[PDB]
Design an enzyme around this catalytic site. Structure first.
Site, short mmCIF file in Angstrom:
data_model
loop_
_atom_site.label_atom_id
_atom_site.label_comp_id
_atom_site.label_asym_id
_atom_site.label_seq_id
_atom_site.Cartn_x
_atom_site.Cartn_y
_atom_site.Cartn_z
N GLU A 111 0.60 -1.39 -0.18
CA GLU A 111 0.07 0.06 -0.04
C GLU A 111 0.78 1.41 0.02
O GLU A 111 0.22 2.16 0.04
CB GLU A 111 -0.90 0.19 1.08
CG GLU A 111 -0.64 -0.33 2.45
CD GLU A 111 -0.38 -1.76 2.92
OE1 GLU A 111 0.07 -2.26 2.18
OE2 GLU A 111 -1.05 -2.09 3.85
N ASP B 247 -0.92 -4.72 4.81
CA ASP B 247 -0.77 -4.82 6.21
C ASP B 247 -1.27 -5.98 6.95
O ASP B 247 -2.67 -6.08 6.49
CB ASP B 247 -0.72 -3.67 7.12
CG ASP B 247 0.69 -2.72 6.84
OD1 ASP B 247 1.59 -3.17 6.30
OD2 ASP B 247 0.19 -1.71 6.99
N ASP C 138 -3.35 -6.43 9.75
CA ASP C 138 -4.52 -6.26 10.19
C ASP C 138 -5.85 -6.04 9.26
O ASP C 138 -5.80 -6.16 8.09
CB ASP C 138 -4.69 -4.89 11.12
CG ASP C 138 -4.50 -3.38 10.11
OD1 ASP C 138 -4.29 -3.60 8.66
OD2 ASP C 138 -4.22 -2.31 10.61
N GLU D 178 -7.98 -3.93 8.38
CA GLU D 178 -7.83 -3.00 7.20
C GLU D 178 -7.11 -3.34 6.15
O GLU D 178 -7.41 -3.12 5.04
CB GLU D 178 -7.33 -1.25 7.98
CG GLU D 178 -7.00 -0.54 7.17
CD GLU D 178 -6.41 0.89 7.71
OE1 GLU D 178 -7.28 1.60 8.52
OE2 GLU D 178 -5.40 1.13 7.92
N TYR E 52 5.34 -4.91 13.03
CA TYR E 52 4.13 -4.16 12.78
C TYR E 52 3.61 -3.48 14.00
O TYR E 52 3.59 -3.89 15.18
CB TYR E 52 3.02 -5.20 12.43
CG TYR E 52 1.70 -4.39 11.78
CD1 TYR E 52 1.92 -3.59 10.82
CD2 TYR E 52 0.47 -4.75 12.20
CE1 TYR E 52 0.78 -2.91 10.29
CE2 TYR E 52 -0.54 -4.08 11.87
CZ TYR E 52 -0.64 -3.30 10.84
OH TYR E 52 -1.74 -2.61 10.31
N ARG F 145 0.63 -2.15 15.26
CA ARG F 145 -0.57 -2.32 15.40
C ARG F 145 -0.94 -3.57 16.13
O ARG F 145 -1.10 -4.50 15.38
CB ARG F 145 -1.67 -1.81 14.31
CG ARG F 145 -1.52 -0.47 13.84
CD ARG F 145 -2.40 -0.24 12.68
NE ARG F 145 -2.63 1.01 12.39
CZ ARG F 145 -3.61 1.38 11.33
NH1 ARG F 145 -4.18 0.61 10.71
NH2 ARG F 145 -3.92 2.85 11.20
N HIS G 224 0.21 -13.04 16.65
CA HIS G 224 0.75 -11.60 16.37
C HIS G 224 2.05 -11.43 17.01
O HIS G 224 2.44 -12.34 18.03
CB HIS G 224 -0.03 -10.48 16.51
CG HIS G 224 -1.27 -10.57 15.50
ND1 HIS G 224 -1.32 -10.87 14.26
CD2 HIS G 224 -2.61 -10.33 15.80
CE1 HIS G 224 -2.56 -10.78 13.80
NE2 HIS G 224 -3.43 -10.46 14.66
C1 LIG Z 1 -6.60 -1.15 10.85
C2 LIG Z 1 -7.87 -1.85 11.53
C3 LIG Z 1 -7.72 -3.00 12.27
N1 LIG Z 1 -8.86 -3.46 12.97
C4 LIG Z 1 -8.15 -4.67 13.73
C5 LIG Z 1 -8.56 -5.25 15.02
C6 LIG Z 1 -8.19 -6.76 15.42
O1 LIG Z 1 -7.47 -6.93 16.27
C7 LIG Z 1 -6.91 -6.62 14.22
C8 LIG Z 1 -6.91 -8.32 13.37
O2 LIG Z 1 -7.61 -9.07 14.44
P1 LIG Z 1 -8.26 -10.54 13.90
O3 LIG Z 1 -6.96 -11.23 13.79
O4 LIG Z 1 -9.01 -10.99 14.94
O5 LIG Z 1 -8.82 -10.48 12.52
O6 LIG Z 1 -7.62 -5.93 13.10
C9 LIG Z 1 -10.16 -2.97 13.00
O7 LIG Z 1 -11.18 -3.59 13.42
N2 LIG Z 1 -10.33 -1.99 12.18
C10 LIG Z 1 -9.34 -1.40 11.49
O8 LIG Z 1 -9.55 -0.56 10.83
#
Ligand SMILES: Cc1cn([C@H]2C[C@H](O)[C@@H](COP(=O)(O)O)O2)c(=O)[nH]c1=O
Ligand SMILES: Cc1cn([C@H]2C[C@H](O)[C@@H](COP(=O)(O)O)O2)c(=O)[nH]c1=O
Length: 557
Positions: free
Chosen positions: A8, A87, A89, A91, A295, A297, A334
């Site tokens: 990105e 990335d 996450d 998003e 990362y 975040r 993570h």
């Molecule tokens: C950048 C971004 C990340 N996230 C997240 C929260 C979760 O902790 C992370 C990945 O989590 P996951 O592995 O459970 O899918 O992505 C959002 O919900 N919104 C956003 O805009």
């Protein structure tokens, strides 16, 4: 027949390209490429999502992005396989999704590569076993933006008609402001209470100085509330015989903190380096894209075995065996925010301004310190008896620096045996006053949001910035102040959108978005439930105040 790799940003592209063979052609999407722009066609049009038509969405390509679009399609045909290296996450997952929809083609042509750092080994492993786009995570990410859009575009207009034009409503932003307005009011309503303390300077038998603090009078805590009570106690303390009743010498330790996660990185960067949340996350991002750190975040304090073994090697070589714990420290797949290579010093970072090096340094030391042994201290507590009073002297001497050795370079109690007589030199009464709750800071607020399960690694920064440029709260002296408008809006929202303003319900929504991301819930059903509750709230709010609707900001005579 080369493989195409999409990221990105040019920076990431630059870095990731160093680790991708000739078989790969890395290209940056330069931005998001595509995104959003009792039903009202016009409302739906502005939002770009239709709550009344099963959340049908209207995604448009962002301005000047059609050029990049046609640039990718063109490179897509020439490639046998497309790697979406956005990335890790949600998003990032959604962006990958959007790129795939635009570039179109067979789903089999797309792989979603995940990596928490841009290093040779991490890219290798990421492109070795490429994964599939996780539609659940994309749905969890869109569910979030859809509801944020809904609250924003449906609550805001009500605020324009009832309170003031231009005001904004935010699903999480209004809850964040609520925390600040609440703090503002606790402080406003705080009535400082006076209390006193009495310190006593004494001499040990060997003539050394010993500072004591009075703790008890008649076995009850010493808490005089005014000048007269303090004087009475002082005249009693002036004639008493002082002697050491107890000598408690105990070994204590201080452990290093866990490696950083998004919220603690922001807290530490703010407290130690004075860096603002936005500044921290912006620099953290550049460090990550330049391949210097993992990362940024995350809310995981996990460290990979390779990372742990590389740091333990650094500690053994650069600090020695006594700083190396028997076994690696493990905190709470993570990863924590840590440097990608412990052998890369803050001073060796290429194209990073001073402050970004300082953030790296903060991250580096925390990472190294977290795998070092505990600092050892010999703590001493002296309990002195003076007539009916009990006094305390606390001391500490560093026995072994342990983890503090990686931190920048930095009370010695005299030797006394239990039973020893002390000579009073001087008594010092001091007036104090209870302090009102501290004001939220750049750090403490994210911390409060993290604590209440409201924020999210990738939303903390955004939430902190969003509630500022809209006249609700302002940062003054690196501290938050709730504006009158913040209180006015917060009262309106708490009265008519209680469920939306409720901390627990807000934390629960994050859980619900996580349920969607983990295929434990379906996004549209989650959005329907949210919209049902929302519209019920909204319908009552639009009504006249006498019908239980929102109070206008009028001050009728
Ligand atoms: C950048 C971004 C990340 N996230 C997240 C929260 C979760 O902790 C992370 C990945 O989590 P996951 O592995 O459970 O899918 O992505 C959002 O919900 N919104 C956003 O805009
Ligand atoms: C006491 C306290 C301070 N802080 C902060 C914010 C600032 O970074 C720093 C205070 O320094 P400052 O007065 O120079 O802004 O410590 C918190 O984040 N939470 C707390 O509970």
């Amino acid at each position: 027949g080369k493989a195409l790799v999409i990221v990105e940003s040019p920076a990431k592209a630059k870095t990731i390209n160093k680790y991708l063979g000739s078989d790969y052609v890395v290209k940056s999407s330069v931005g998001h490429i595509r995104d959003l722009p009792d039903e009202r066609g016009a409302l739906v049009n502005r939002m770009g999502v239709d709550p009344w038509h099963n959340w049908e969405a209207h995604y448009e390509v962002l301005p000047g992005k059609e050029k990049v679009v046609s640039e990718l399609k063109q490179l897509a045909e020439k490639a046998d396989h497309i790697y979406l290296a956005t990335d890790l996450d949600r998003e990032g997952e959604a962006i990958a999704w959007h790129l795939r929809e635009v570039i179109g083609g067979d789903d089999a042509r797309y792989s979603r590569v995940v990596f928490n750092e841009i290093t040779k080994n991490a890219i290798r492993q990421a492109f070795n076993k490429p994964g599939e786009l996780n539609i659940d995570r994309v749905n969890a990410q869109q569910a979030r933006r859809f509801m944020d859009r809904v609250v924003g575009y449906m609550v805001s207009p009500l605020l324009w008609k009832k309170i003031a034009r231009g005001l904004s409503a935010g699903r999480v932003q209004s809850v964040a402001v609520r925390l600040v307005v609440e703090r503002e009011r606790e402080i406003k309503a705080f009535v400082p209470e006076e209390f006193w303390e009495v310190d006593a300077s004494t001499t040990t038998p060997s003539g050394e100085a010993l500072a004591l603090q009075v703790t008890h009078q008649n076995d009850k805590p010493f808490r005089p509330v005014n000048k007269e009570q303090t004087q009475a106690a002082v005249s009693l303390l002036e004639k008493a015989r002082y002697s050491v009743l107890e000598r408690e010498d105990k070994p204590t330790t201080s452990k290093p903190g866990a490696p950083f996660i998004t919220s603690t990185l922001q807290q530490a960067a703010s407290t130690r380096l004075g860096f603002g949340v936005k500044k921290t996350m912006m620099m953290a991002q550049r460090l990550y894209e330049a391949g210097y750190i993992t990362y940024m975040r995350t809310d995981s304090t996990n460290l990979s075995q390779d990372a742990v073994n590389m740091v333990r090697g650094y500690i053994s070589d650069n600090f020695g065996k006594k700083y190396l714990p028997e076994s690696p420290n493990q905190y709470a797949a993570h990863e924590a925010i840590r440097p990608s290579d412990v052998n890369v010093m803050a001073e060796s970072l290429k194209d990073m301004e001073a402050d970004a090096q300082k953030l790296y340094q903060l991250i580096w030391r925390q990472f190294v310190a977290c795998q070092m042994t505990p600092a050892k201290y010999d703590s001493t507590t002296l309990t002195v008896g003076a007539g009916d009073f009990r006094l305390k002297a606390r001391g500490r001497i560093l026995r072994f620096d342990g983890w503090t050795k990686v931190m920048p370079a930095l009370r010695i109690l005299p030797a006394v045996n239990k039973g020893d007589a002390l000579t009073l030199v001087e008594l010092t009464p001091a007036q104090h006053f209870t302090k009102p709750p501290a004001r939220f800071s750049e750090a403490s607020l994210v911390k409060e949001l993290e604590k209440r399960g409201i924020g999210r690694p990738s939303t903390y920064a955004s939430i902190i910035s969003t509630i500022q440029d809209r006249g609700y709260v302002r940062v003054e002296n690196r501290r938050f102040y709730a504006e009158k408008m913040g209180e006015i809006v917060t009262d309106r929202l708490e009265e008519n959108f209680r469920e939306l303003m409720n901390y627990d319900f807000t934390a629960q929504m994050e859980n619900s978005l996580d349920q969607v991301a983990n295929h434990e819930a379906e996004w549209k059903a989650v959005l329907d439930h949210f919209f049902s509750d929302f519209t019920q709230q909204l319908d009552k709010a639009e009504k006249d105040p006498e019908e239980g609707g929102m109070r206008p900001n009028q001050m009728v005579l």
